């Protein structure tokens, strides 16, 4: 009968929680150039020394598939993106009948029909005057009316706006930081599965810097973990779930657009300009990406070796290319140099287990796959562009309804943007600090 309730305040315990995290940057992104979406948003620098605290003996359960931080990042990016277009020029006046031809001059056969030379009647700065102008368009954005009359692809569905010519969408790394009263716990287990208990937990103020890189099928410029290739999925057994594969070595991919572009500016209203693609200088060649087979064949062999752990050591593992659907799903959607590429990856998934040039299409009117109903027009970039990126992971799915268990088929798939962030945020969890608690002691008032 001698034990009494003692109330304590400042007890080091926590509970799972969902809150709003704020973004932070390295300062330098804003200090130097600004004029980009993430430097402008992330106005608060991180601490120069965001030292983590190791928690001795702490075991905590993580679940990357239910991680609220991922859902927030998705929402924040879309909102940021929209607010970056809001102030710029609407391109409504371009939704007219166009008079187009085949370009023809200096085209390698692989590029025949890819570009069109279109003339049209657009307004000038004065309401009562018009001008006849012309520009090049990529075939993918131009749809035939009814053989010379064409419409822009967005005219019957969506509003179209011009992306701001001075704003970069470069994926500058950002950090998510907790508000007071909250903490971010992270798993330091090098082989963490994506779910379940982790016995190596530290507490941080901010996450590591994450580059908000947008792509589909092949994940670019992320983490390579540390020791081994890890295959993780919400279910594994259920083929309907995406499998996120994290590589332990990167594969370098070299992408280019070889055509030397120029640009012309057309005045379309008081204070407004339209950026049009001008004539190509020199030869017209196809855009493409190079993957070295020397590394790619070994990389897939490693994936298969690990993949077998869930499927059988005598099972046939087949890689195959994508299924049908929009280019955002069926090809490697890739945003680089300020232009949008849609690269054909079938040359990468053509093997059965027990240099590679990928041609690429270029598109300017983009229904950014965040939603349908608002199209973005990407202004052209002068000169030529080159990108060198690190492939750090893959998103694969399985074919259900297989004839038998002897053979499993893996294809590039997914493309939902959440999985491009889930793969970096998989090790972080947000918890709320709860300072009150009680315990029996031997003291009485």
């Amino acid at each position: 009968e001698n034990l009494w309730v003692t109330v304590y305040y400042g007890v080091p315990v926590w509970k799972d929680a969902e809150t709003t995290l704020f973004c932070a940057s390295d300062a330098k992104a804003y200090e130097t150039k600004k004029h980009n979406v993430w430097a402008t948003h992330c106005c608060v620098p991180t601490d120069p020394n965001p030292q983590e605290i190791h928690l001795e003996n702490v075991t905590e359960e993580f679940n990357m598939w239910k991680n609220n931080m991922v859902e927030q990042m998705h929402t924040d990016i879309i909102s940021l993106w929209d607010q970056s277009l809001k102030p710029c020029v609407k391109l409504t006046p371009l939704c007219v009948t166009l008079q187009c031809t085949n370009v023809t001059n200096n085209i390698t056969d692989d590029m025949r029909g890819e570009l069109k030379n279109c003339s049209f009647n657009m307004t000038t700065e004065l309401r009562d005057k018009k001008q006849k102008v012309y520009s090049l368009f990529y075939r993918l954005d131009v749809v035939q009316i009814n053989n010379k009359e064409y419409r822009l692809i967005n005219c019957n569905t969506s509003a179209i706006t011009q992306a701001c010519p001075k704003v970069s969408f470069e994926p500058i790394p950002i950090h998510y930081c907790a508000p007071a009263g909250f903490a971010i716990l992270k798993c330091k287990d090098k082989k963490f599965n994506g779910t379940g208990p982790c016995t190596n937990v530290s507490t941080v103020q901010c996450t590591h810097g994450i580059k908000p890189v947008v792509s589909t099928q092949l994940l670019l410029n992320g983490s390579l973990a540390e020791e081994e290739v890890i295959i993780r999925s919400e279910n594994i057994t259920n083929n309907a779930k995406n499998i996120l594969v994290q590589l332990n070595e990167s594969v370098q991919i070299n992408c280019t657009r070889p055509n030397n572009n120029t640009r012309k500016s057309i005045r379309i209203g008081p204070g407004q300009w339209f950026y049009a693609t001008g004539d190509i200088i020199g030869d017209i060649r196809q855009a493409h990406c190079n993957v070295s087979k020397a590394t790619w064949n070994e990389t897939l062999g490693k994936v298969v070796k690990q993949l077998r752990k869930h499927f059988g050591n005598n099972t046939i593992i087949r890689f195959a290319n994508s299924s049908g659907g929009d280019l955002e799903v069926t090809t490697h959607s890739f945003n680089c140099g300020g232009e949008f590429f849609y690269c054909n990856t079938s040359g990468l998934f053509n093997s059965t287990w027990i240099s590679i040039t990928l041609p690429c299409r270029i598109k300017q009117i983009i229904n950014m796959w965040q939603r349908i109903g608002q199209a973005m027009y990407a202004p052209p970039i002068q000169g030529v562009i080159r990108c060198v990126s690190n492939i750090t992971g893959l998103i694969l799915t399985r074919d259900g309804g297989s004839t038998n268990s002897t053979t499993e088929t893996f294809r590039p798939g997914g493309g939902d943007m959440r999985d491009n962030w889930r793969s970096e945020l998989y090790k972080y969890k947000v918890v709320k600090i709860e300072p009150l608690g009680v315990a029996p002691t031997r003291c009485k008032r």
């Binding site: 034990l3 309730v5 305040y9 804003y30 106005c43 007071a180 903490a183 315990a439 029996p440």
Partner: protein, 136 residues
Amino acid sequence: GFLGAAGSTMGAASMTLTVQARNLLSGIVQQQECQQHLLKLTVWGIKQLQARVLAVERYLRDQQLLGIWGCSGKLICCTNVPWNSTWSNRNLSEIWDNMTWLQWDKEISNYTQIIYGLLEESQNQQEKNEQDLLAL
């Protein structure tokens, strides 16, 4: 060393109560250009205010409870409510030298509201009795 504990026994962890207490409020004022830019983001600005207002409301809620229970101003408060063996049938060495607070909470979370109600009742009676004794 904010969560420098939770990997130590309940007894050892009593030495970090001030550190945990000072995470709120000081950690808010401390937050301290384009901060002007962000005022143009109406939804974002509202969400941030809601987070700050809420953090304050949570802080005050807990302080009011310490007030009600007669533990205001203390980090460690002895009370007149006896411990029930059914809330947890464990001895002092057993919990103070082995459990880590996180574990303890998980085991007695079912009695939280019961205990809080008891703490309020004891304080109510004590305050009245003292005033009646003060008046000769």
